[PDB]
């Protein structure tokens, strides 16, 4: 399927014990996939102070249009020292290695994969 439906933990950024994806932008793009498969990927909300806790590069989900079932259609754009790879619409979340923590919510997405 070119979109799958999930249910993404969202979690408090200092709660999150692995703060990023990998070390490049096509590593972490590539594993942010992977973990979305594999139902082990955490979604912290982006505000002032959130992502200087995090480690670039980031990977952002991304609003792609304007919502089937509940769940919001996004795509992933990667972000390195300033620069974006890839363009879509406005933030979710900054996503993040689940392992355990405690969500404060779930944010339903239709994941263009």
Known sequence: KTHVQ???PVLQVRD???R???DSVE???SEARQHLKDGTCGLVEVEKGVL???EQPYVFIKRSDAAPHGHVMVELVAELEGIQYGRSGETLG???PHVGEIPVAYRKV???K
């Open 110 to 112: 239709l994941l263009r």
């Open 6 to 8: 999930l249910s993404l």
């Open 52 to 54: 200087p806790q995090l």
């Open 27 to 29: 590593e972490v793009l």
């Open 16 to 18: 999150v014990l692995v």
């Open 94 to 96: 900054v996503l993040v």
């Open 20 to 22: 990023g994806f990998g």
